[model samples]
Target: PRVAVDPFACPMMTMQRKPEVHDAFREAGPVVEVNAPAGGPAWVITDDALAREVLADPRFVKDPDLAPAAWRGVDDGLDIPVPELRPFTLIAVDGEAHRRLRRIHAPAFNPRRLAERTDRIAAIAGRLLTELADASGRSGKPAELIGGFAYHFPLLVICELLGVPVTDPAMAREAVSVLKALGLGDTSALESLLLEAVHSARRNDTPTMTRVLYERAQAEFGSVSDDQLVYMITGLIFAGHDTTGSFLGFLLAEVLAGRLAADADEDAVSRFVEEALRYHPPVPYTLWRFAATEVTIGGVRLPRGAPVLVDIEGTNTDGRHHDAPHAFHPDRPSWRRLTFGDGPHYCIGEQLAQLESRTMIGVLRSRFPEARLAVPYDELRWCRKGAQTARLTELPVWLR
Candidate 1:
């Protein structure tokens, strides 16, 4: 069949009606190729069982070279050069390269390691809430949930964990905007802003991860070149906070929207975080994959070098794996949901992200037990671009 471009075929729609689409895809089958406009031909896998199969099977590779120019974020003469590309952190690498790097980074993200930092994370949450308290007092209104609280909280946590100062939360937020711009096919201004943020974040006497990496690189591996250090730091700074930032915004929005309250008690927000992940995942799609040889998935035959878009959002919403798949019920068991993905390429930061989110909601409820969205749900704006990041431009809430 010829490729087709359907706007509804896009993952952004999941942020609006996650359940409706989940049912549609589950009944349809696990894999459906979409001819996305401007994006080119690609497969959208929805079934959970089949999604697991595709993720684990060595036949399916995660190397970047196999993808088409369009899927890989290139157009005509404007190609994403390796120098410009973020370093091949584990997600971008596969096989031996991935294994070596993952070995070093995996221990840093272990649940046990994460628990060791709970005291620190909790203290950060308290400080963020304190700022929100001031904002609410000054405005004579409830805190602006997304802007005043959720957005800055994780930035501070990441900065502290990595030894960076949250001295410029405003600047950090602006840098995140620039990073998102690059991924969404809008990058002329991104170049200057990204470089500027890199410079500002690496001042001397600053013990930020960027500085630490450079110091270690020079002492241990001899002089650290600009590109390698920049590449590694850029990815870390962005990945360290943005996903958590977006998840905090989306999760609070969903919970305050009463989607999670249907089954979540005050104590069940933890479970709600897990269920919301399936109901509205942050990384709605995989980091793009290419088939090295012809492979058959869900009875569909594919030729070698074909592009595969793992429809993660679609898979989590699949009814075969989740009961009433669309509704955001925190009680919805998600042990089988492919929210954090599966197999060898699963997200390394899964535990950290979860801890950050649960702490955010938990603290919000505890501090402002009666806090609520000041604006109606319909009035809020949505950022529905990229592989998996749905966010609200603003979320004004009333703390009673």
Candidate 2:
């Protein structure tokens, strides 16, 4: 017997803007069984403490090998094959292997390294906004941030950081399509595009993250081949760009909605960004995890290979986790939010994402102090395409 859950039953839940569904899950108790969007029954841990406990527990491993025998490669209806991608990414490995890969990757995204890149990050945002301002003048309409600046800025920044050049409009457009495909759960052409980029990076003699990763791989793990390193680089780009862009769009919208002070300083901006991360996480749920063995979470006994998800947004907003969880309050005593996740698989790009968001927000506020949403805030539509993440389909804004 399993507890009933149906997150997919409501279209609003897919958008993730509506908290009622998540609240129902929490009200149902800490753990409940739901039919996963990808297919099959899965258990969701809704409580904050229990979610962290489940995340840290070794029995609920990320490796696909630990998945149920009946389960196909896909989870949550997304065509994610953990083992199919070559060279075994950090997300695909566990225990000592994960630690080794994380060790090699951590230095590139360290706080100091990210801080050093702040000026460059701000420049990227400033340039994109300038372009948006120009486009707005030419079109005689509010600039559409999602397809125009929101999508390209982070991608360009990551490309510059990784040493891949999107100098040509044709190539940039193609890369954007690939990113869109990835977010929409189609990966057929993603590998080919990323592999091509990696090959291009190898021929260039630039001091980029890609080059550093390749050099590190060669020096640290002698057996690791170039192709393996390429896979890791591809993963990093995909991981870094999409979510950060989503956060930027949401943060900008929040800022423009008069949610924060117009004369906010750096500290005020940072606090608002942190609060936004908690209130509206880029991804609504964690990557699907499977039970390594029988385990009890929130007093519910899950059998081996049972699909498990920690409701990230739900746990972050659960009333038990914080007082007045639904309200956005930057002044509240700061507590760690599970937006970047917790435990071993916590996002490697956490610092980079925060820096990018904070920098972009600060730049936008300073540059477009009079910016406003073109349409009423309630009229702005949330995208229905992605299963794991929530994003605005189009964030149209007037650059007045």
Candidate 3:
């Protein structure tokens, strides 16, 4: 029922891909015990059915405070939130508290609400891509689409959704740059930037996500404190941009390399987007799910305090799902996308993420049908190795 493997021994900073323990783990059993990246032993759910079972199971807690005591605070396998903003963050909150926050967020991000902004989202995508092409023309250099296009595009979209005005180009460019510095100790600066915007969301008349969040918070819990409001906003920013940033890059990488179509129609693009998400999800593992009590997963017994990780990509690539599990076939029908995760903690931005991806593909292909990766597909590199997120160091492309 279980096997021991050390998947993290492969360097985080690698040229091709993270160390693959697929067969080593899955071949052994649905549940595999692995050495934690920090220290001590941890369990991974490699089977999709078992993964869903554990995620929905009451025993698995998403709270890091419940994480093994020795972890203390480093995410060297420990995903420690900023000490100052930990309590109010959505990623760590669970149960009824989570549902309350989820409700506050749901309306603003629902498909009907976002459908109203389809053109606006496309325009933002077009505007940013055009800006990149123009700047690339003047410099005669291929644009680095990861930061300029993939990363900034979603930041702006999230801002628009939040009803925060990022009118100044300089501030807009620098605002979300902190996402790149994951090693830094303090996010107080990012909090300061978000506070100004959170203030706008509270006082403004527009029905932005932040404004609606404020309204919903007031309706449900009287008034939102500055700490809770800002931290909530911060979570949205990271959740929206950080994941989407790498996902955008990964999706576009496929199109540029001809693994996926750049010009797929609205209907087909959804299929393509689904495939891209499964192919190389940004977050390779789910957040730590602590065992509140002894639990049986895939016929393996785990003690109460066990730390569990659902291998998102591994299950997406499970042998049962497709004949060519490792192949990048966009046209194939899909079965899994633990990419967005599943169950109560399913990605709240699923609709928004798909919309952004499909819109970008539709717009980009029409605008620059001949665009191709400036570097060979394999030559393109993925950074943020040991970190939960996987990002391209640079995605240089010819815009024309």
Candidate 4:
């Protein structure tokens, strides 16, 4: 079965609220043909079983170069990267080339590596909270976590860990701003900002992820260009900041609302994060996966160059995958969601994101136990305007 629905045009809804687009797509069928934002047929898969298969299927690749020629711009569901930089982008490559790039960066974020940074991440959260308190004390306004901490912490964590020192707040602000821009704006300024980080690494200032990435590439390829190092680090920074920052906001909001138990143990905190991800996925849909060659999915024939989107929001909350899928139940058995995606192209920062958030949550419970949302959860305004993730406009809270 197939149907017509403009999922992108749907209105913003709060975390606990349900959007009609999710229901329409799931009910239409396992694989439904919907109008692509760029004006073409796009297939959305809602079946959890099939979603996993398609992601791992070699026929469906991540390169925008394979996207339908008729598709144009960011509204097309995938941002068409500028031509010259496309080949080096980790998100845009596939097969051996993709693996080569992935290998260069994966070790930096492995569970063991990230374990070493937990305290540093916690301290970042502590410092930001103090800044918020000081701001609230001076202005008499409740500190807004989205701006004060949510957006800043993840970006700051990434930059510091990547060993890019002296990153200003606007860098984090621009990370969120560009996502809200809908269309990819000029990132030359942003690239130049991170480029300096790479230069420092090459200068052998102090060893950093940037230094490691630079050295790794040189040892593997015999030599790697400065431009290559700059782009890879840029991709890692933007991708890490954009999605993880949004998730941090949602998870914290839940904690304040008392929806998530404040003092949960590590195992339970992991479950809470997973449930939050399922309930309000920051990246509602996976990046558009293009059919590398003509292929069949769910008995439906997808022509060469067909654009496919895995309905991450729909499948994660699909009843087939969870009991009472619509409800936010942290105590429900731990189930993996496609939030970070699945398969070889899975997010390299998964462990880092978890470490950062869990560490922040630890700090909050230990220090800010009396924190509470200033308003009801549903009363808080939200922004789902961007095609990527929905987030609270501001989360005002009292840290008594």
Candidate 5:
């Protein structure tokens, strides 16, 4: 008998949360074929053990060059970039090149380094929430958190850390929208905006990750072009803010809905963040991985150049991995989850994300303990925007 396949249709360009879909994928088997959103057949690993094995397998590589010929010149989300943009990006390459980029980027987000920025993160969160409250006061209605605060706060935080020069609230929101659009394969005008931002940072001599990377690249490679710096900075800005913003919206919604303890202590808050990450990962699946050569995963054979995705959401919630996986319990023994991924491509911003989330939760609880959902939980809408990400279309809350 042929295996069941799901045509993962995403009309809204968002990976809207669908626990039933994830459950269906898991019930199919360890590995099942699916029609990828970007077009063409792909294999999805739904079992926790198999997903980990696939992520760690040397034969499954991140290089876009290994993607199937059908995906060539296509925005299948992992195709090799145009010649002009191809260099040593953290996502486009693996092995030593990836390690080199990781070295340059990792220090900026290391635990100790981010620890130094905790107060600033808290301040940013507080300032944005204050504005949200003021706006609600004026409107006499529930404040829309997604547009007013959730989206801009993380972008502003990343801009400050990277010296991106987008200080105005409107500009920050526009920058985030463009980044999110780009992630959904709408690259229109994104390159120009990113290039302009990098140039502005350079002209101002901003002491940020962009400057640090530029200097490092020049010293090590003799000379690094502005476009190269722009590409690197663009990836950082998008990765640093986009998913964090998505996670923040969900985290706040869950907190306000009474799904989590409102007055969680510091340690409990940290654990809560971990649990939330597992329960509601911003990205539902790993970025497309192409088989460099014919290989076997989960006892199934995949041809060379076959596209693959590890079901992060499915595996994280697999009953085999956790007891009562459907329940959200922070006190449950901490189990390893692929929320930040695993192996060589583990997220570099993991520590910073944790800190930001913890700080945001703490601030929200203290400042607006009475905050609650403006609408029924079932009425809240989610976007089907990108294949890799899941986010609320709008998060409306009444802060009192």
Candidate 6:
């Protein structure tokens, strides 16, 4: 007999802004047993410290043979066969394959390399901010942060880095839409967008990383089919934009909201974003390991071939690990947060993500110190029913 899980009862897994899931996991402590819905796998593990233990442990591998089969419905690939739902990109690949791919991309995302591009990012951010100012003036109100600033600037920066010129508004808009919609729907939509982005990128004249990647593939991999190129480019853009976009929106919102608090300052806002990454991470739950074998985590026995879901959002809010985990405080004694996953599989774009966020935040603080939400807090809508990311659907804010 298989264990059963009530889908409605587990809103955290399927829905957005699940404070209940956070509470349940915290109450359950270092290890908690979860029985998923009938349609899916049965068991789940939710514990922060132990999540770290399992994800980082060599015995508990992320690469499972049946992973692509499981993800078939969850994702769609560009060129890969076997009905690959999950693209066999760096994030999904395991063992030596994962390491090799990461090595090739890692140099491009180096903190030092990211810093070198600061001037370019700052210029683009400044242009977007100027556009926002103009829009706010024309509308006789605050601009929608998502469209005017958060969305456009990051996409531009990422495009510049990838050596892709998003001169076509339609293509740029489509890329953002597809990446953002990935959170809202199934993998097929994401796959279509991925293909479109690659097609547009190939026509651009920019000297970028994307071009370099294409050149390398042509030289080493022979023929270099369009579908494979699409898969590779989509992976880069998808990885680059999704987290950074969500992070920027959330961080900005938090900082603006904190201005009301007496202690809120630039340093505090910076710390708040850091803590938020740890406490209320955008990409909270990631499709982690498919249990290679029966393993005991937090003393709970899970069978071999089980799909492991890491509850990063739940862990970040664990009161046992963080002080006043529920409350947003910038002055908290420690500034440690795991917005990015740990160990060998940690995010390749971590450096670029940080640089983009840090630079944008600095510009905001300097340019519009009094920026505030133009609408009430409750009125703000967040993207719902996502596996990991939770971002405001729209942020209307005043640039005062």
- Predicted structure with the largest TM-score when compared to the true one: 4
Question: Model 2 — which ten-residue stretch has the worst lDDT?
Answer: 8-17
TM-score of 2: 0.87
Task: Provide the lDDT at 169 for model 4.
Answer: 65
Clashing pairs in 5: 13-384, 13-385, 13-386, 14-384, 14-385, 14-386
Q: What is the lDDT of candidate 6?
A: 0.62
Going through the candidates in the order shown, the clash numbers are 2, 2, 1, 0, 6, 2
Q: Where is the poorest 10-residue window by lDDT in model 5?
A: 7-16
Record all residue pairs in model 2 with backbone atoms less than 3 Å apart, i.e. clashing: 38-76, 38-77
Q: Stretches of candidate 4 above 4 Å error?
A: 74-76, 175-193
Give the C-alpha lDDT of model 3: 0.75
lDDT of 1 by residue, 87-182 (tens): 345565667656655554565566775777777887888787777777778878777777776667777776565554556676776765565445
Query: Which structure is stronger by TM-score: 2 or 4?
Result: 4
lDDT of 5 by residue, 86-187 (tens): 455666667777677777777667577567778888899999888888888998988888887776787777777776556575665555556544433344
Steric clash pairs (candidate 1): 19-326, 284-388
List residue ranges in candidate 5 displaced over 4 A: 1-4, 7-17, 72-76, 173-207, 386-388
Error of 2 at 199 (Å): 6.7
Q: Which has the greatest lDDT?
A: 4
Runs off by more than 4 Å, candidate 1: 1-3, 6-16, 19-28, 70-87, 176-230, 257-267, 376-383, 386-388
Error of 3 at 184 (Å): 13
Q: What is the lDDT of residue 47 in candidate 5?
A: 79
Judging by TM-score, tell me the better candidate of 1 and 5.
5
How large is the C-alpha RMSD of every model relative to the true structure? 5.1, 3.5, 3.2, 2.6, 3.6, 5.3
Off by over 4 Å in 2: 1-3, 8-17, 68-87, 168-207
lDDT of 5: 0.73
Q: Candidate 3 lDDT, tens digit per residue, 153-243?
A: 8888887787655654335545554542342224455556668777887778777678888888888777678667766776677678878
Candidate 5: Cα lDDT at 31: 83
Q: What lDDT score is found at residue 2 in candidate 5?
A: 20
